[PDB]
Amino acid sequence: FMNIQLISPIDAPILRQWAEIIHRYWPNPSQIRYGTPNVFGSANLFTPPEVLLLPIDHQPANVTTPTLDFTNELTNWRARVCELMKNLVDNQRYQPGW
């Protein structure tokens, strides 16, 4: 899993492409700029002051009337997982029974 090259392409295909999906996308870090430093002293120690590390990505409010889009990170992730499972059911050598 560390080096994707060790997984053989034609002779471990689903493992190879699932590892490729994992290294290609997974949530990225981010930060939000909370708080005030003036009246309140900085309670964090290891980060710089008043910053808040977030394990997924944010983009701020485009508009205040929210409506649906799919061009974001977690619907992206769910779409890739479903693409793998469609490919897995597509490859006939794994299940001959269905």
């Binding site: 996308y25 990225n28 870090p29 710089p48 983009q59 701020p60 485009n62 061009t71 992206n76």
Partner: protein, 1024 residues
Amino acid sequence: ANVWGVRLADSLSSPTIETRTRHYTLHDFYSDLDASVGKEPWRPLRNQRTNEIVAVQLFRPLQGLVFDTQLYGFPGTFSQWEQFMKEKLRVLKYEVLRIYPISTYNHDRVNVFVANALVGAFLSNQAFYDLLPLLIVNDTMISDLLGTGAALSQFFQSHGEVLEVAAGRKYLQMNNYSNDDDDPPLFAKDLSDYAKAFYSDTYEVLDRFFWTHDSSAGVLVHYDKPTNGNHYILGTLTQMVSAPPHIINATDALLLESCLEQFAANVRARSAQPVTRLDQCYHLRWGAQYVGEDSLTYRLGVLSLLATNGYQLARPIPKQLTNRWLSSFVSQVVSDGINETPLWPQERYVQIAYDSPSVVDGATQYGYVRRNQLRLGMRISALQSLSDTPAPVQWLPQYTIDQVAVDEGDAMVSQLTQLPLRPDYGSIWIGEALSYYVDYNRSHRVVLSSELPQLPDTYFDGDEQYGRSLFSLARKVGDRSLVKDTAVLKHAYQAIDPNTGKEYLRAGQSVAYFGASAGHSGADQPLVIEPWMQGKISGVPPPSSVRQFGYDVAKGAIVDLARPFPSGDYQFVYSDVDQVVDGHDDLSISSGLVESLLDSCVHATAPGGSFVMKINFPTRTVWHYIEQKILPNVTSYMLIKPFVTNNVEVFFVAFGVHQQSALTWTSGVYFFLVDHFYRYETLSAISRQLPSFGYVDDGSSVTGIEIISIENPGFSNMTQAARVGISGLCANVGNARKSIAIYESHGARVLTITSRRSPASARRKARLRYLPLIDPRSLEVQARTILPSNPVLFDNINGASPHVCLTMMYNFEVSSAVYDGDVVLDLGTGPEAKILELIPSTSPVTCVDIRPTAQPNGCWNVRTTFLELDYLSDGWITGVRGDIVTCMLSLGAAAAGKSMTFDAAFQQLVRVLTRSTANVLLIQVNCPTDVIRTIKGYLEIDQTNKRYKFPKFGRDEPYSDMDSLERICRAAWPNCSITWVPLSYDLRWTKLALLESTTLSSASVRIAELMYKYMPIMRIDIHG
């Protein structure tokens, strides 16, 4: 040098002159949005093996590809992709030309950010129309971004005087890219968001922002001429995979790309081409207080600092980069040996050298600081690379004045030994057979049977079989029986018999053949039958009918030839079967088979005809029987021996059978047979010393090859240990030819020193006490890639030249004439005197030449002497004395140099040898002995003006004759005794040619004999 992997600085260069750049026009926007053939916003990259397009490079009209390629949906082939991009840009082209007229907006500006995000939102279909009217910029560049039209955080967000943008997708991967190392690298520039850029006005405001912003992954700047205003680079945790051993993150990938671009710019700087950016490197700003020493980002920061200073690498970089070379570079940079430069990266400011050729501190103002306290002892000019050749090239050493122990050289060559590997053998002997013939003369002499010398009794030794098998396996032919039969027929049809006045034999003789092998990979008979029937030999008469006999035929019948089977009698029969296969390894049964086979051949000859015998094992009974029986009953005879194999067989030919004649053996036949057995003994003693056919060499034998392998980091003055190693191999090899090779061995540039040892080199190495050492400069200048070759035992393929042959002749007779413990003098020593290799190890020299030599002066066991004094003069032999004079090839050279005749040169030389103290002498004179022959292409003649004019050397000199030489020699010395040496027809000299591992090409040695009878030497004692 070697920072961690070696770099070849030796000087440092930088691009001095600079293009100031132009800015945007909307006319240019339409021009490069129209994808013309001459210019278009993309540019393809291809493989280095298939030249197939696996990646593309795009630039200024589009940068907003930050979204996912699943949302985009591009095809897989480059042609369909580029026409797809063409038609989508055509649609957006029509849209933007609807919303803006060209006439009013002929020369107005734009936001490049709005342009790139516009084409990105159009390709991703993400409602670009709110972004559309913000195209034409206002008074400033960034205030339109701060006061936003519509906040579009999917492309760019504001932060109170600091603009955040997501620059993405400088490159784009095509689906045929498969992480091959020969494929070009990508540097993680094809992912969704490799980094984030912070465009704003001033670095003070940006650092006040970085007080609160995270700086965990490091921050990169450009400091020279930014793309769209002053900014920073914030790489993310996405990593680069395309290097197979190493996994680097985004910031290291960008810094490595930028530093390699600066390394490319530092070589191409030729003080006339202005470039688009003065420097390239990034200079990590705030991460130095986060990450620490011995980290990869820190080490690449060191390399980027040295690159901005203007250093240049060791290996020549490719024009198109590969993952293979990139990973080799990363493996070299994480190696060892931390630093040798006085330079260290900083966070307070950037630093450039006091003697740096860059002028970028005076060019732009902020950030670039000139340092005064740090100085460099290096040079200023550029650097060039040498042109590689695929063939191994020769090298010649030059000796210095220092010396170390030969035991130290032995220790260093034992350290650097790469002896145990199998070499390619080759062939010791090419060409054809040699005409060794003698005829019967009636009135010549008379000898007896018992006087003849024989085979040596040490014939059936395993060592003798070893030597003869070594010779017969090393020797190269077509068909040996073809060569032997052509030689014996060309010598058979020469002379005339005393009975008939015409000749020996005629056309249409209805011949017979004995002992046909009939296996020659086709034409199942001996290979002379068809060309000899057609008359293709062109020295023979063609026969009428040919019958082949023997118990291995294909067309005839198989008959025991030893027991007499009567058949049809033919005018000429030819025996070719041995007595070994029919024999049972005994000289008695060999002689008895000779008896029976010769008896049947005599009784089946159709008398008045002739026959040819071959005899492998002649004995007392054989010679006594043929002298008592055949020699009376024969008219004439012939015995010849062509030579391709080391053996004792001869070819006996009869003439005129069944006529009585008082006829015995003669002393000319005796001298021929003595010299035949003697040359057999000498060449067997030669072949006994040589190693086997398919062996491995390990430096144990006195003759053989030797190679060593060292590696050279850059143009560094390499160590004394490797210098002692190379000079010890030089002392081991003894001024012979040598070839080198320079190539990257498995991640490191290596050096090979390939040559061959010899016993003459062994006596040279034993002659001197200390070994001298060499100049490393002639090895340290080279920077080209000399591709290696397989180790071969024999360098020469076409054969030795006749001039090499005469040099070997002369060296052999000088080495034979010299003895141990003797002062000598060499007149005209040449470039490197072979007299050092000829004489024994304990005898000194007093040698001198007009040519200034580079022999190692001093550190000898027995002393040497090297100087130049224009030897054809006087006064100096009264100073330095000797015992025996060796003047080889310098007589004609000095006579052609001084334009004077051999008579005057020889009388002056014999005058200054009456000044000498030598009792014996031997000099190279140029005297015709036989009637001159005007040898084609080597030696023509001149009757009147008396010159020779060698065309191969392009040299020319007169000749003097032996009676005038005798006149001058007896006018000088009334007591002297002269002995003209005979020509080495016994091949005693051949050991000094074979042990130096060089083939001969026997036409060359025939020309060498025909030439050596035209400049012989003599031996003159002062007494006699």
